[PDB]
Amino acid sequence: NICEITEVDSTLVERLGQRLLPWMDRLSQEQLNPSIYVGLRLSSLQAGAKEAHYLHSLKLSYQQSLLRPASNKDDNDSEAKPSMGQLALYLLALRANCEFIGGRKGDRLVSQLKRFLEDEKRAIGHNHQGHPRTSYYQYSLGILALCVHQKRVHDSVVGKLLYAVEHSVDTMAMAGMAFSCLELSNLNPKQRNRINLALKRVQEKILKAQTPEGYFGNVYSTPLALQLLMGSLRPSVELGTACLKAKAALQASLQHKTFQNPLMISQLLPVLNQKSYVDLISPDCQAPRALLEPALETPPQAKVPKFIDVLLKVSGISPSYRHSVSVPAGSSLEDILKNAQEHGRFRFRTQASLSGPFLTSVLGRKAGEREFWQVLRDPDTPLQQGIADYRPKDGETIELRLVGW
Ligand code: B12
Ligand SMILES: O=S([O-])[O-]
Ligand SMILES: [Cl-]
Ligand SMILES: [Cl-]
Ligand SMILES: [Cl-]
């Protein structure tokens, strides 16, 4: 296939995998990450049989938390649990171990995911003058996750996604993979034609989105886009060119340590192994993988490091707030934040996600329903990495801006 990453330096891939290895020891309820486990299982890499403990840890945790009694005694809360989109990835984790969801606990969970989608269908509503409470990315994730387990969704639910696509790149790709999955499964034959037409649309909007550099959307949407695109069934001359450009562009960033984020790597590894979430319909759990071994190194400089002087600014609320910090080069935005909070009038709050610390609140202002804290490098360039991964350059002005999407 033309859209498949054929050539990859084994030592590049080994490095990426090594970035995921430490997370296999990180088994707390907030650190457990179904997306990492899927990423590895579909990769050419193995992270010890630490993997088995991981999946087991997931299993126990996603069950204990989501299947809690009729009304829990005296709180209405005690412990944040997995989101429904996360549950969809848990379902993917299961397939990656060649398991179908089952038994009573597994039925209850499929139900939960089904109720999720229904509630989103209703939030959208009627004739689409409404937004999912989460997003169409999670909507598609949900349909996809049930599809790989041979579980059918109501035609009405699937319609909502189909309409959305018929009338970004990451959501295109996920919607695409859901569609691809439903076609290959023939789970909704009563709209078999409409789904096909939707994939052509999806493909189109992705290539349309390609940047001069070769990226579909940006470097980070690229892995997910390639996952959907290696599924072909429309192989063309424009599609071949696009994929060739996209692939070279992606390999180019791999020599620049561009991928640092565990979730991002977990979306990248399958691509480097000619695999996609759609391969979870029937996974090959017999296929060998190279064992990753602990690095155990990290070169001790004993140097005096460069410092960056960086300026932090908060906008989109009254009052705005600036802050001046000098920190070691390679410090992350998150380090700079923690520092500002520690040595200054700054404060902020993050909450866990599978991508890591999501910035939810700044200076006592929590983002609401359709608001979020955007992070940008001034002037008006939105960052492509989160607070923990983005390592500011010298002189930069970093803006935390409360926006209404
Ligand atoms: C939907 C979405 C959003 C929504 C999330 C709110 C919502 N509507 O639910 C919005 C639009 C707010 C958003 C914001 C941002 N996003 Co976003 N987002 C996505 C998308 C499409 C899906 C995420 C999702 O639903 N995951 C599924 C569920 C199961 O995962 P989850 O962990 O439970 O989901 C939560 C987190 O993903 C969190 N979140 C969303 N984006 C990001 C980014 C980072 C770095 C972190 C730590 C968390 C985070 O929002 C979800 C909770 O609702 C992904 C695409 C992808 N390829 O993964 C990008 C993606 C994760 N986002 C990304 C980026 C860059 C950002 C921002 C930093 C943008 C910016 N310049 O400010 C911010 C985060 C800022 C902050 N406050 O911390 C990148 C990450 C790249 C990387 N190297 O890690 C992705 C991959 C998109 C891309 N291709 O560039 N995002
Ligand atoms: O989808 S995220 O990049 O805002
Ligand atoms: Cl239930
Ligand atoms: Cl990254
Ligand atoms: Cl805060």
Side-chain angles (χ1 to χ4, degrees):
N1 182 251
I2 198 140
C3 282
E4 286 180 17
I5 289 282
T6 174
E7 207 79 313
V8 258
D9 186 4
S10 88
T11 52
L12 290 163
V13 180
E14 210 253 55
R15 263 201 285 155
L16 282 166
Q18 216 124 113
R19 277 163 219 155
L20 296 177
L21 198 39
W23 293 87
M24 296 295 94
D25 289 322
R26 286 164 192 168
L27 303 176
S28 92
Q29 223 202 129
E30 283 205 326
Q31 296 166 297
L32 284 180
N33 180 326
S35 192
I36 301 199
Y37 181 86
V38 170
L40 279 163
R41 291 308 301 271
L42 294 174
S43 69
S44 60
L45 297 161
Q46 161 159 34
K50 270 191 208 297
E51 277 173 31
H53 278 115
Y54 207 75
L55 184 65
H56 195 67
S57 274
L58 286 170
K59 281 189 192 162
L60 264 44
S61 155
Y62 275 55
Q63 286 164 350
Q64 73 145 14
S65 310
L66 306 173
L67 313 166
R68 271 183 172 114
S71 63
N72 293 326
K73 321 280 144 45
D74 215 18
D75 51 65
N76 251 65
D77 191 67
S78 211
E79 224 69 278
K81 51 192 190 195
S83 80
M84 284 302 111
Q86 275 154 31
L87 176 57
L89 283 161
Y90 170 63
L91 257 62
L92 296 205
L94 288 187
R95 294 301 295 134
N97 194 49
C98 289
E99 280 177 59
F100 287 94
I101 191 134
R104 311 220 174 99
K105 299 188 307 251
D107 264 1
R108 284 198 55 190
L109 295 182
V110 160
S111 265
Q112 287 195 16
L113 191 49
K114 279 195 204 190
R115 294 171 160 88
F116 167 61
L117 297 148
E118 168 64 32
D119 288 358
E120 297 292 54
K121 170 185 102 181
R122 312 170 75 116
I124 301 158
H126 42 82
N127 38 279
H128 311 88
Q129 322 296 272
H131 304 295
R133 209 189 75 254
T134 69
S135 52
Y136 288 96
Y137 182 90
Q138 284 190 53
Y139 202 80
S140 312
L141 193 50
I143 301 175
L144 172 65
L146 288 163
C147 175
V148 287
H149 286 265
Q150 294 336 289
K151 304 288 176 204
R152 180 213 198 152
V153 272
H154 278 57
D155 291 41
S156 44
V157 170
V158 189
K160 297 298 164 146
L161 181 44
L162 283 160
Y163 191 110
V165 157
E166 287 169 321
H167 301 107
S168 265
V169 156
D170 312 59
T171 314
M172 297 288 84
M174 197 62 68
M177 288 189 300
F179 298 151
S180 173
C181 188
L182 292 165
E183 191 188 69
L184 296 167
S185 289
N186 205 57
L187 281 174
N188 306 134
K190 281 255 286 181
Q191 52 201 154
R192 178 226 324 113
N193 181 47
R194 198 185 165 192
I195 295 159
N196 192 27
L197 269 58
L199 272 162
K200 175 82 281 284
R201 257 259 192 173
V202 161
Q203 176 170 117
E204 260 160 33
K205 296 192 168 190
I206 293 171
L207 317 166
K208 192 177 175 291
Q210 194 160 29
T211 70
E213 313 90 57
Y215 305 123
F216 295 126
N218 60 35
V219 65
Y220 295 114
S221 321
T222 305
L224 253 183
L226 283 173
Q227 286 196 28
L228 186 263
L229 285 182
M230 75 176 74
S232 320
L233 285 176
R234 233 101 196 205
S236 85
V237 201
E238 23 274 281
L239 180 48
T241 308
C243 278
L244 293 187
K245 246 163 73 72
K247 296 182 301 174
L250 191 61
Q251 314 252 59
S253 62
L254 262 32
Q255 326 281 128
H256 303 104
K257 304 171 299 153
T258 297
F259 285 78
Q260 300 285 285
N261 186 244
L263 191 128
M264 288 290 80
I265 304 167
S266 79
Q267 288 190 5
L268 176 67
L269 276 181
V271 171
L272 298 181
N273 198 40
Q274 302 103 75
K275 262 156 185 204
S276 76
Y277 296 161
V278 187
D279 285 282
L280 299 166
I281 305 169
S282 57
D284 187 4
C285 300
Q286 309 289 295
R289 292 175 298 154
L291 190 70
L292 285 154
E293 278 164 333
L296 220 81
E297 38 208 317
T298 80
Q301 314 83 36
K303 275 252 81 198
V304 165
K306 290 201 130 164
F307 269 40
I308 56 173
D309 313 295
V310 68
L311 186 39
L312 167 69
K313 79 160 172 169
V314 178
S315 83
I317 65 164
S318 198
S320 56
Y321 170 88
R322 295 135 297 276
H323 194 99
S324 166
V325 296
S326 295
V327 299
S331 296
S332 61
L333 181 43
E334 188 188 19
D335 293 319
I336 280 159
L337 293 197
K338 279 172 192 158
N339 183 79
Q341 197 175 239
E342 164 79 357
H343 301 120
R345 288 249 82 196
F346 189 64
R347 79 184 212 76
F348 78 102
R349 284 179 286 157
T350 65
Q351 66 187 43
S353 72
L354 312 180
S355 297
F358 181 55
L359 182 60
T360 49
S361 182
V362 179
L363 288 152
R365 239 300 213 146
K366 167 154 191 208
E369 175 63 20
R370 289 201 74 81
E371 303 175 338
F372 86 104
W373 279 103
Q374 185 163 58
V375 189
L376 311 87
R377 164 201 325 123
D378 187 89
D380 250 281
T381 306
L383 301 185
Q384 309 193 331
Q385 283 174 310
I387 57 170
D389 304 306
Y390 185 72
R391 324 206 102 96
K393 293 275 198 304
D394 194 17
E396 275 182 344
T397 287
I398 314 307
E399 185 179 8
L400 316 171
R401 173 193 295 175
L402 171 70
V403 310
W405 116 109

